[PDB]
Design a protein around this ligand. Structure first.
Ligand SMILES: Nc1nc2c(ncn2[C@@H]2O[C@H](COP(=O)(O)OP(=O)(O)O)[C@@H](O)[C@H]2O)c(=O)[nH]1
Ligand SMILES: [Mg+2]
Length: 156
């Protein structure tokens, strides 16, 4: 039983992601102030588990064992902001190497990318971190992210 925290600028898809993950549903635009927390049972490689995800609105962060930091490939400011999210996990859980998974959401808005995939991969080498592009819109790559976060909780 593992508690994970989604971190990210407003509007990048933390919510659409968490909900595509937990119940295979996209919310087109969801009350943005609602920081939800969603307990679910899943099965990871199988060795199967329970995760309590805090979906943040961009202090249950003392107790958080894992972070998904999220940006939108369409929004460089969101991406630069992953670096403030970074030094928050550190001021808080307190080292240089918490379990962390870096994600660029909205990969489906490819005509509108302001952020390259090698940029994301290079921020991920900073954290030493797995890195993913997802589209929550189309549930693309969404399981992989949460399952990799789980494998860094347990590899640490
Ligand atoms: N095209 C597209 N839109 C998305 C995706 N994920 C989220 N959105 C849209 O982006 C907005 C914010 O989603 P949301 O999950 O609520 O962002 P949050 O503020 O991080 O929690 C809404 O207008 C969503 O429909 C995506 O993968 N693709
Ligand atoms: Mg939200």
């Amino acid at each position: 039983e593992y508690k994970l925290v989604m971190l990210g600028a407003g509007g990048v898809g933390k919510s659409a992601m968490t909900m595509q993950f937990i119940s295979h549903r996209f919310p087109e635009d969801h009350d943005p102030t609602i920081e939800d927390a969603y307990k679910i049972r899943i099965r990871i490689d199988d060795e199967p588990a329970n995760l309590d995800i805090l979906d943040t609105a961009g202090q249950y962060m003392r107790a958080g064992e894992g972070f998904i930091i999220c940006y939108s490939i369409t929004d460089r400011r969101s991406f630069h902001e992953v670096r403030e999210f970074k030094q928050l996990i550190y001021r808080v859980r307190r080292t240089d190497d918490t379990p962390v998974v870096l994600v660029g959401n909205k990969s489906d808005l490819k005509q509108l990318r302001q952020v390259t995939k090698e940029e994301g991969l290079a921020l991920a080498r900073e954290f030493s971190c797995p890195f993913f592009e997802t589209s929550a819109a189309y549930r693309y790559y969404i399981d992989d992210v949460f399952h990799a976060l789980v494998r860094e909780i347990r590899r640490k």
